[PDB]
């Protein structure tokens, strides 16, 4: 499905690129001293890669579990997400409103 493919593409881009801001500094400026924080070089164990313009997901790639609770209020539901560190499950949750 389109929604799956355009998020596999996202996390594969981010983690293969190894760095949270692949874009040129003339398109997303970085504080030069602090660019080391955006680098992911030992790939994190989990990533809450939050994004309001993509579907929710809880993918895994290279052992990195990347989750996105994309937006709090969407399609007349409140949306929130329960990551469980001692098992790495990711139970999505919603309240209708």
């Amino acid at each position: 499905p389109q929604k799956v493919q355009e998020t596999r593409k996202l996390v594969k881009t981010i983690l293969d690129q190894g760095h949270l801001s692949p874009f040129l500094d003339s398109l997303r400026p970085i504080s030069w001293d602090l660019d080391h924080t955006l680098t992911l070089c030992p790939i994190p164990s989990t990533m809450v890669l939050c994004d309001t313009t993509s579907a929710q997901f809880d993918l895994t790639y290279n052992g990195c579990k990347v989750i996105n609770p994309g937006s709090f209020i969407h399609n007349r539901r409140a949306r929130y997400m329960e990551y469980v560190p001692s098992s790495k499950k990711t139970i999505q949750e919603e309240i209708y409103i």
Binding site: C41, P42, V48, C50, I67, G70, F72, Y80, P85, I97
Partner: protein
């Protein structure tokens, strides 16, 4: 795109540094090391704590919309029955960006954010 590298492979081939201070702080004469036995002990404790849960709220949680606040009141009322270990709030806590006001009649942008 150049192939990503699994966490273990990266850590073992850079020399297993503590790049966080999870085990110890570094100095210019002393790079902190991510001690294997302590790593294992922590990992076993991590698997032991079945009950810990991190709750992540969605983005664009505008505090200045009553519908957001109503929804959120319901959610937090659920969470008070069984508290998270940790609770990530995030992302743009106001509907408009909060910038230098152009007028003094309305309550100013900064003051509104504080409210």
């Amino acid at each position: 795109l150049p192939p990503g590298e699994r966490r273990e492979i990266t850590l073992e081939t850079i020399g297993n540094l503590d790049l966080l201070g999870i085990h110890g702080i570094s100095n210019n004469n002393f790079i902190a090391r991510l001690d294997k036995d302590l790593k294992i002990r922590l990992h076993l404790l991590e698997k032991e704590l079945t009950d810990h849960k991190f709750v992540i709220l969605g983005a664009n949680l505008f505090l200045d919309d009553l519908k957001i606040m109503t929804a959120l009141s319901k959610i937090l009322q659920k969470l008070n029955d069984d508290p998270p270990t940790l609770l990530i709030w995030q992302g743009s806590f106001t509907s408009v960006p909060v910038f230098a006001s152009m007028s003094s009649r309305n309550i100013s942008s900064s003051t509104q954010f504080k409210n």
